[PDB]
Design a protein around this ligand. Structure first.
Ligand SMILES: CC(=O)N[C@@H](CC1CCCCC1)[C@@H](O)C[C@H](C(=O)N[C@@H](CCC(N)=O)C(=O)N[C@@H](CCCNC(=N)N)C(N)=O)C(C)C
Lengths: 99, 99
């Protein structure tokens, strides 16, 4: 697809059977999702956002689908205001920026 | 041009006669640059990200030159970790997300 930025690039992702809306975010190294429970063991991580730092829960090898593209990878769960699809999964689906 | 997400999408911008480096951020509504001396008037605003809320000095109709293309828009100056080019200016230089 080709997406323009007149509006927030919200997209539909399916994570473990459930459907959620996520924003394609080029400024995010990683993928951060709102609070939830995934199928595994988690480790602690600290991420830095604009307003400061947050502790998140790292899960690995998580399968997620993004607009029909399935991805497998690291997902961070924490107190984020919105689900964010970072570059770790953006690189996987073939996403690039163009002008 | 086409930008890949393997690394942080950093670009060089010229604002106020100064050359800066900034992140092409599709997750950002606006453009927020680190604390700098810029001439003009301004009114405060508040915004938030993953860390929380920050108070920024809002400046409007500012000319920024991003990778060769000139552009007019609002610029927020505050405690941002990195200079950010938000959707407000990414739209102006014709940037799209493709995958
Ligand atoms: C990982 C992360 O943290 N990466 C940041 C970018 C940046 C953070 C500092 C280090 C380098 C990378 C953003 O890429 C993520 C994005 C974000 O921080 N973007 C803000 C900032 C720009 C701005 N001040 O506009 C934003 O868009 N703020 C809007 C509210 C929209 C949120 N959406 C809803 N609540 N629905 C606002 N008007 O305050 C998420 C949290 C939504």
């Amino acid at each position: 697809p080709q997406i323009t930025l007149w509006q927030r690039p919200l997209v539909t992702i399916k994570i473990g059977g459930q459907l959620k809306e996520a924003l394609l975010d080029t400024g995010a190294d990683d993928t951060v999702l709102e609070e939830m429970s995934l199928p595994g063991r988690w480790k602690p991580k600290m991420i830095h956002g604009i307003g400061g730092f947050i502790k998140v829960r790292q899960y690995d090898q998580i399968l997620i689908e993004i607009c029909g593209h399935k991805a497998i990878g690291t997902v961070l769960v924490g107190p984020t205001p919105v689900n964010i699809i970072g570059r770790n999964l953006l690189t996987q689906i073939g996403c690039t920026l163009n002008f």
